[PDB]
Design a protein around this ligand. Structure first.
Ligand SMILES: [Ca+2]
Ligand SMILES: [Ca+2]
Lengths: 167, 167, 167, 167, 167, 167
């Protein structure tokens, strides 16, 4: 019997709540692009100025070890991978309570990329928990406190402070 | 008076729990690279075979309106932007309880990229809630049920079913 | 025993109050850049539009006598110096009480440079008192009055009147 | 109605005394250079060996928004600016009470540069208080103590400890 | 399961105390060179004449078996290794009580190099215990006496007595 | 009279315990090579596969000031020095509980080099204290806490975190 380990058992994390607002695609979204490797989905609820779209794509990874330093002797026979991308694009607007003529539009976009080796032992739950570990790096954990606590670092990183405060 | 709207007020969502594992950087992580716009951080807790790193980087965006279908209204403060990347790199290991000889290492990686315009009305909370909307696209929601239900997408997407099954 | 003199004992000065607002770095500032000779520190308290940063840097001076006219016979054996720079960068905003849509941002910056020879006899107090003499040149002293008084010349200098009024 | 804010209202500071020695230019200083944008002034009181000068200069700034991350909103009065420099140059002397032969001269110099945009709402007092905030960065402050306490930085910075010890 | 043995189980030692003076880098040191493979650190508290420095470097070892007697049939699958160097450089001064003009500076340098194969089973504790055994060779052990005793050997080796007394 | 100072009087350290396992050469070792400059010693108690060796060598240093920043006016009259090397070579074995046929041998090597000027004032105790300071750099010191504490740094450096946490 073969067993896969993520080797995160010895890491120190703090749970924190991150409540997702999941779309209702049937109500809100229509399909803009259905190419075999790339789908694009548009938000029908928006006015013409405001563009709200999502993009879901996969690419095949020739050599999953290509940029890693894992010794040849420890590489899987199957070296193929899959690369997933999930992009969301939003259009925000700025206006004034006092002046109905003041306004402009700001474009926001953000995406997630996930590079998964093609191996039978990797499961959907393993990958979601990987995503949870990933998104957890937008915070800093504090086990010093008696109830374990977390603090936000997204603004700090955006401002150029990329090293955590814990170091 | 001045108000920024994300124009999500007419989108239909469903909440779901996504509990993040935030790192205790003080225990686990040390700095491999401290250059001004790119920081690399390594996980002290892994053994020598396993490589576990995180990378935090920003890039300055020249014109946030350039690739978009949005363009700049006359009273916009700036075209400038900032692009943030957060990457995690893990080394998973497959072994066998039958054969001590049999084993290999799988490389996992994933990252998030966020493209924030330079407008002071964008707040840290606005950005986190944007990230929550983003990660929501790894799921599908149902308004119909009395407790709202969410199903998962990550498998179906990685398998090539890039259109939501709700559509 | 060796003694250093600044030779300012024969100069005529007027004390005047110049009350410094010193930062609380722990509360307000995070680190943007930690290069060995140049550190940059950002003000976390500001909104995204407003940039508030400080820069602290040192350069080594090859020949401290390079541009001076001190005779060779009176030069120290050790000709190395240190050049310190302290820059502050602020973003000011202009708005209207009456019109909540009227606004713009102004960039302010200013720095101090201090070129100190590497000599054991120069002390931290000597250098601070040098800085006090330096900043005192933004004023004009008046010993003619019975209580000695001072007047401001920053605007006059900015407007092109670089000679003091006392001459 | 029109109000300029320096946006320091949410920064945390601590006051400290910094008593300036303002020159009595009429007694001590005479003009070496009177060219329109650069004035050099020499200290009459020094002996022939010791050189003590001050230099006051302005340069016109073409676009005050050019090197900055700020850029000009549509209702800004001008891009123009003025850059002021104030330099002091001193000649310190080391001698020995044992040997009449032993002596040398150390050259000290330091200057301040101020980059003021052309907006009429910037006042002379705004600029002086900016200078006070600037010089405050040669210190570190503590909100904690009941009389606020400030420690010094100039030594630690010149020695290469460019990050505040509070951080 | 897999087990590593250092094969020191049956070798005979005598413990002796060797109390390390560990640096407080935050108070005493600054970074001179920040390279990915080689960091250089310097003591900013020393006076100018006395340069106290340290150097921390890693080279990567291509074949850890290159200069060993281990036949290939007994080698691991992975030949990778890393090589660590820790160098310290001090400057001592000799002077006189009776004569202020008499003195000179002596340079001391020393370094450690450690050549660790990349095997997950090599632990940080294993490596430190190896270092302790290494430094034990600067001594000679006697377990025949009622209290186990050790005599120092550094000066003897420096003076050409390289073979231990016991041999 | 003449006095040597290591100038470590004002530097800040934290003591930590490092108990050396000193060899009993009479029981465990034999001499492999007896040269005037290089002695090689081997563990005769190890089984045949496991080679445990040590090497003790001295080279003579022509100019101890060759790669130093010490100007000639500050050098001793004698440039002679000696250079000591102490190398240890071990062979660790990896095997399995479940499988008698599974195993391999890992080579460990490490050495120390010490570069001592020939000055009568350098004592054996001075040199051992220097070695203790050297090995202290494998740790990081914290004297702020109520008990002075130290954390290990060997694995962190091996893994590319070469700059101390404190810096
Ligand atoms: Ca660097
Ligand atoms: Ca003229």
């Amino acid at each position: 019997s073969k067993i896969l380990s993520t080797n995160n058992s010895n890491s120190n994390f703090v749970d924190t709540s991150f409540t997702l607002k999941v779309p209702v695609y049937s109500k809100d979204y229509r399909v803009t692009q259905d190419e075999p490797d790339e789908v694009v989905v548009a938000n029908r609820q928006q006015p013409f100025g405001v563009k709200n779209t999502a993009r879901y794509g996969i690419r095949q990874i020739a050599d999953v070890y290509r940029n890693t330093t894992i010794d040849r002797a420890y590489q899987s026979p199957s070296k193929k991978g899959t690369s997933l991308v999930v992009q969301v694009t939003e259009t925000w607007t700025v206006a004034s309570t006092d002046d109905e003529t003041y306004g402009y539009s700001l474009p926001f976009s953000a995406h997630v990329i996930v590079n998964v080796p093609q191996d039978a032992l990797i499961t959907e739950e393993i990958l979601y928990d990987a995503l949870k570990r990933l998104m957890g790096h937008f915070y800093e954990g504090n086990d010093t406190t008696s109830p374990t606590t977390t603090s936000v670092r997204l603004k700090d990183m955006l401002q150029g402070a990329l090293v955590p405060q814990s170091l």
